Ligand binder design. Structure first.
Ligand SMILES: *[C@@H]1O[C@H](CO)[C@@H](O[C@@H]2O[C@H](CO)[C@@H](O)[C@H](O)[C@H]2NC(C)=O)[C@H](O)[C@H]1NC(C)=O
Ligand SMILES: *[C@@H]1O[C@H](CO)[C@@H](O[C@@H]2O[C@H](CO)[C@@H](O)[C@H](O)[C@H]2NC(C)=O)[C@H](O)[C@H]1NC(C)=O
Lengths: 48, 23, 23
């Protein structure tokens, strides 16, 4: 995540980092937690 | 619907508080 | 004092729990 930007690199699974980065913009993590597949497909289509 | 959800129990604070006084 | 406040009802989670087991 961004935990290496402050101190030591502290690992975290990418769905959970994605969840907190959704929490940082206003929405709650549950929207991501049942839209994970759609979010991943949108990310892949955009990066393609 | 959640991927990777594990099985565990939560603790309701009201459950042991209602029956100690009423029952 | 609030302008534009509408009339509605809220739900108390304690209310159905207290009388279900005590009564
Ligand atoms: C968590 O516990 C529940 C128990 O409710 C498990 O649900 C079982 O799932 C299997 C597979 O679908 C069914 O055959 C059983 O009938 C379910 N149990 C009941 C009581 O209905 C669930 O699989 C458990 N999850 C994990 C990750 O262990
Ligand atoms: C919301 O409901 C309350 C219920 O009390 C309404 O208040 C009453 O309004 C009438 C009409 O002015 C008065 O005669 C009553 O005395 C009021 N009740 C009390 C307890 O003061 C209120 O008007 C409703 N608001 C809306 C927008 O419907």
């Amino acid at each position: 995540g961004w935990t290496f930007g402050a101190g030591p690199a502290l690992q975290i699974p990418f769905p959970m980092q994605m969840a907190y980065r959704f929490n940082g913009i206003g929405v709650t993590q549950n929207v991501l937690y049942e839209n994970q597949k759609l979010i991943a497909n949108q990310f892949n289509s955009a990066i393609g | 619907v959640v991927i990777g959800i594990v099985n565990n129990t939560v603790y309701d604070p009201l459950q042991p508080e209602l029956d100690s006084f009423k029952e």
